[PDB]
Amino acid sequence: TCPFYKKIPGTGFTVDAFQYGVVEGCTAYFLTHFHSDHYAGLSKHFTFPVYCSEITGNLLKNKLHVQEQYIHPLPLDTECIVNGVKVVLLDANHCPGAVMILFYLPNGTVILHTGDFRADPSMERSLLADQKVHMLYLDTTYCSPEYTFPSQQEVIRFAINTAFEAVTLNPHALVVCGTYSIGKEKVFLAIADVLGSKVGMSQEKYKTLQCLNIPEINSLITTDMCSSLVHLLPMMQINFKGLQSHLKKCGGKYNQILAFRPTGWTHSNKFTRIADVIPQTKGNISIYGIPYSEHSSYLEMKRFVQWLKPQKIIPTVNVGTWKSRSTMEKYFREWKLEAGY
Ligand code: NI
């Protein structure tokens, strides 16, 4: 049965609610982004209207095989009418195609559903600023003060400089980047651009990237592994055993690997600035863990919510336990007392 936090009150809308079969009373199903926990349940068997971004629509058609008749793509930053209700899609600064949804309810209430997002100050100068938002459905993945991370830009600068030095020292070195879903494409795109290379990958991953509306994509990516000095592999293969095996597959064209493992937060964010990062090394393989996040840090989330000043917050992440719900409610109350709303 569909949770209250996936329902938009006073409409027949749901958000990211595809795993419960037919939701009683739902006339439009919104999908914020193409990550499997959010799309879970969608397939060629789905026969109700799905509303989403153009990129998400491309992935639904080509990867999940949802029939075109049921896909309703909407443009960004544009006031649209769905089933008689005014809505706007905004860029979520998450993965490609990911949106936040603003609902203007018939009774005058305004609701923002963030989907998954990485809060940014640029959001404070969007359409959100034009009117009071009453209710916020919030991505609370990192809603605790221990969760700090660097900017995406600091992480990319470190990755570019690391890769350029290693390949200039050894022109027979290969660069490998781990992946398991869409998102974090700038890691491998920026490394390949500094090296003057295309990115090589499997046919299944190439198919995915070709759905993302990236300008000039045909000049950036290839299925011809031999021709390229940056390769993509499943995140599970970024270990010494997997990378040795891969080296053997490539036909001696390379004699060394430098690999990147973009993660979320892991315990050591607590001490270590990006400039101090050192890799784990075994013989001719070196692996760097890089904290490249597509979710808000605690400080980023707190800034956005204190700017927005909602009357109610509904969390959408870590809502399955009491302990977690209670801890989040304590931070919301602090934020509200500090900022006066
Ligand atoms: Ni996500």
Side-chain angles (χ1 to χ4, degrees), residues 1-23 25-203 205-215 217-240 242-247 249-269 271-281 283-311 313-341:
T1 43
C2 186
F4 78 116
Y5 68 88
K6 302 191 177 272
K7 289 172 170 178
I8 306 300
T11 70
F13 304 160
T14 61
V15 181
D16 297 353
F18 297 94
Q19 75 197 288
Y20 313 96
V22 179
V23 174
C26 182
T27 72
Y29 294 77
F30 287 77
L31 181 56
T32 63
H33 68 289
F34 195 76
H35 276 165
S36 58
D37 279 358
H38 298 263
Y39 67 73
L42 272 165
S43 75
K44 75 191 86 185
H45 315 332
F46 202 78
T47 56
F48 300 86
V50 177
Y51 286 83
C52 59
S53 68
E54 191 182 314
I55 291 165
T56 296
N58 295 346
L59 294 158
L60 299 177
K61 180 188 176 190
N62 292 286
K63 301 292 293 185
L64 293 186
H65 296 302
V66 174
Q67 288 172 59
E68 201 149 51
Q69 71 186 104
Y70 306 115
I71 307 174
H72 295 260
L74 302 175
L76 302 190
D77 300 313
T78 306
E79 302 174 343
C80 299
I81 300 303
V82 183
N83 297 357
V85 174
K86 181 165 98 165
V87 305
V88 173
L89 296 193
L90 304 166
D91 207 290
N93 188 42
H94 184 54
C95 70
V99 302
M100 316 190 287
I101 312 157
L102 242 204
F103 300 92
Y104 295 78
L105 263 37
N107 73 0
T109 298
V110 178
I111 297 183
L112 179 63
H113 193 308
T114 72
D116 283 345
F117 84 140
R118 182 160 186 181
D120 191 73
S122 62
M123 303 170 172
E124 302 163 26
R125 289 176 296 281
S126 70
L127 297 187
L128 297 174
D130 291 13
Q131 70 293 286
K132 174 191 177 83
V133 175
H134 308 91
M135 296 185 74
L136 175 65
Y137 290 62
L138 182 63
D139 169 16
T140 44
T141 300
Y142 295 125
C143 188
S144 194
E146 72 273 22
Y147 294 122
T148 60
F149 33 65
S151 72
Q152 296 176 163
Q153 193 274 334
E154 294 175 71
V155 172
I156 294 296
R157 171 92 281 178
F158 170 87
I160 288 171
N161 294 352
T162 302
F164 180 78
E165 172 166 322
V167 181
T168 306
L169 294 173
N170 175 195
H172 309 273
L174 174 65
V175 184
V176 177
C177 295
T179 185
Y180 40 27
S181 56
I182 65 171
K184 317 190 184 182
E185 288 76 12
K186 185 67 171 181
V187 180
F188 57 83
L189 293 173
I191 296 163
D193 174 79
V194 82
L195 296 181
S197 183
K198 300 200 183 198
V199 187
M201 60 200 68
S202 75
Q203 286 182 266
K205 188 80 192 185
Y206 186 89
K207 183 177 176 184
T208 303
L209 296 189
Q210 284 290 165
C211 295
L212 304 186
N213 291 346
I214 297 163
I217 191 57
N218 297 323
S219 76
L220 303 178
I221 65 171
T222 186
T223 55
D224 188 2
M225 306 311 268
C226 306
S227 59
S228 160
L229 50 153
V230 179
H231 292 177
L232 306 189
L233 287 182
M235 204 67 76
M236 286 185 97
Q237 184 150 15
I238 312 296
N239 53 71
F240 297 118
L243 292 175
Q244 295 155 203
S245 170
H246 183 72
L247 205 48
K249 260 153 282 167
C250 292
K253 189 166 196 305
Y254 311 107
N255 69 353
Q256 185 190 336
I257 285 170
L258 173 79
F260 295 95
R261 295 200 351 107
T263 61
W265 180 103
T266 62
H267 190 49
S268 53
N269 254 279
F271 310 101
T272 319
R273 302 140 136 62
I274 194 73
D276 298 347
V277 176
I278 48 170
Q280 279 196 222
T281 307
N284 64 343
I285 302 188
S286 261
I287 305 175
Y288 284 86
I290 55 175
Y292 189 94
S293 180
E294 298 183 335
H295 294 277
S296 308
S297 72
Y298 175 81
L299 286 168
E300 296 163 351
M301 187 191 302
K302 179 184 175 290
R303 176 181 168 125
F304 175 80
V305 174
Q306 291 185 308
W307 171 78
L308 192 71
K309 304 179 173 54
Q311 298 176 349
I313 305 176
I314 305 179
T316 68
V317 184
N318 307 320
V319 294
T321 78
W322 314 115
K323 162 179 181 179
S324 284
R325 284 190 169 282
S326 183
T327 304
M328 286 187 291
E329 283 166 15
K330 280 177 41 271
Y331 289 116
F332 305 151
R333 184 52 65 169
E334 281 179 24
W335 301 351
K336 174 172 174 81
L337 285 169
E338 175 169 27
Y341 53 96

